[PDB]
Amino acid sequence: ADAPFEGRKKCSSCHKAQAQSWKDTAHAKAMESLKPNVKKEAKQKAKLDPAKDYTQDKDCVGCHVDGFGQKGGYTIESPKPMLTGVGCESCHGPGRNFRGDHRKSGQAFEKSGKKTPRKDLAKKGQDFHFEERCSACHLNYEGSPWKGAKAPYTPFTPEVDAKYTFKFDEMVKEVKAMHEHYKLEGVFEGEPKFKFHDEFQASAKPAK
Numbered sequence: 001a002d003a004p005f006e007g008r009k010k011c012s013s014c015h016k017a018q019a020q021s022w023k024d025t026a027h028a029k030a031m032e033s034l035k036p037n038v039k040k041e042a043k044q045k046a047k048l049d050p051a052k053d054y055t056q057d058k059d060c061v062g063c064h065v066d067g068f069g070q071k072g073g074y075t076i077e078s079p080k081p082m083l084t085g086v087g088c089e090s091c092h093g094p095g096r097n098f099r100g101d102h103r104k105s106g107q108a109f110e111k112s113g114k115k116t117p118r119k120d121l122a123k124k125g126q127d128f129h130f131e132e133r134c135s136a137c138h139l140n141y142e143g144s145p146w147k148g149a150k151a152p153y154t155p156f157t158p159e160v161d162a163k164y165t166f167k168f169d170e171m172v173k174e175v176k177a178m179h180e181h182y183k184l185e186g187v188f189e190g191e192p193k194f195k196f197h198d199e200f201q202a203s204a205k206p207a208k
């Protein structure tokens with residue numbers, strides 16, 4: 001089983017606070033990095049060509065868009081703007097099947113306070129762990145600590161520069177590059193629950 005990708009539109013329409021915050025992160029602008037003459041210095045350090053247009057190179061786009069190589073995902077032949085940049089489904093998982101449960105569950109909660117178990121969403125493909133997905137992009141290089149590495153690899157590795165060292169427990173809390181967290185009403189409950197969920201909700205900004 002597995003759900004296809006659809007893009008950021010629906011998620012963004014119901015979750016405007018996260019979407020507006022996400023919009024300003026490096027992830028949202030990931031495709032701009034593949035354009036000619038952008039990030040020239042970093043590209044030279046990694047021995048890449050600073051003037052090359054890498055926006056349609058299959059050795060690069062896969063980690064700068066949503067669901068490359070997966071059903072419903074971004075393709076160089078049909079590069080959907082709503083799948084351009086590392087977006088919502090790249091971390092939360094393809095949403096085709098679970099976004100429907102977010103709608104119905106939210107309606108049920110608004111009408112009667114009924115909560116829905118996270119177990120139902122995980123069954124529909126939602127990710128509440130994240131490590132593996134971040135790793136498929138950030139730790140995808142030869143000999144990396146992550147067991148799933150396979151080409152094409154990311155040019156940006158600790159070997160190129162120590163700043164490219166990725167540690168999940170640290171980076172997932174990187175407030176300068178992850179979307180801000182906002183308070184949830186509590187529609188969903190139970191396991192699997194992200195290990196830092198309560199920590200993030202206790203420190204979250206008001207839903208407004």
Ligand code: HEC
Nearest residue numbers: 010011014088089092095099102103106184185186187188
């Ligand atoms: C409106 C019809 C929604 C759409 C479209 C999507 N989501 Fe949703 N989501 C919705 C509700 C009413 C809730 C509960 C909010 C609350 O206050 O409790 C959610 C919740 C989430 C969560 C949090 C899950 C948890 O562990 O508690 C996430 C991470 C989330 N939604 C993500 C998400 C994504 C990526 C979507 C696009 C595929 C998406 N949602 C669509 C309502 C709606």
Ligand code: HEC
Nearest residue numbers: 026027030033063064086090130133134137171172174177
């Ligand atoms: C591939 C589809 C990715 C997934 C999944 C995740 N990240 Fe990522 N991240 C990716 C790229 C291509 C970039 C660079 C964007 C650009 O063009 O500039 C990034 C960047 C970050 C950063 C900022 C840079 C840094 O400080 O290291 C952070 C903090 C980051 N990414 C974190 C992160 C986490 C915690 C993820 C899983 C929840 C995650 N990323 C997934 C590509 C991809």
Ligand code: HEC
Nearest residue numbers: 033039042054059060063137138140152153154155156164
């Ligand atoms: C996933 C396996 C990737 C492939 C294939 C490529 N890139 Fe990407 N890129 C990836 C990550 C995880 C990051 C973030 C690194 C960090 O920690 O900051 C990036 C980042 C870039 C950047 C920005 C670098 C910086 O600002 O210092 C550029 C310019 C970039 N990537 C270009 C690029 C090109 C041209 C690729 C094909 C040759 C390419 N990347 C592939 C992950 C992945």
Ligand code: HEC
Nearest residue numbers: 011012015018019022086087088091180181182194197200
């Ligand atoms: C990986 C780099 C992510 C991207 C891209 C997006 N989100 Fe996210 N989101 C991420 C994490 C690790 C978490 C915490 C999980 C938890 O259960 O605590 C979240 C959480 C949310 C939530 C829950 C409420 C909140 O924390 O604000 C929502 C509604 C949510 N995310 C929505 C969302 C949307 C619409 C995105 C695309 C614009 C999006 N997220 C991208 C990691 C990542």
Ligand SMILES: O=S([O-])[O-]
Nearest residue numbers: 106107110185187
């Ligand atoms: O519909 S409720 O989750 O705001």
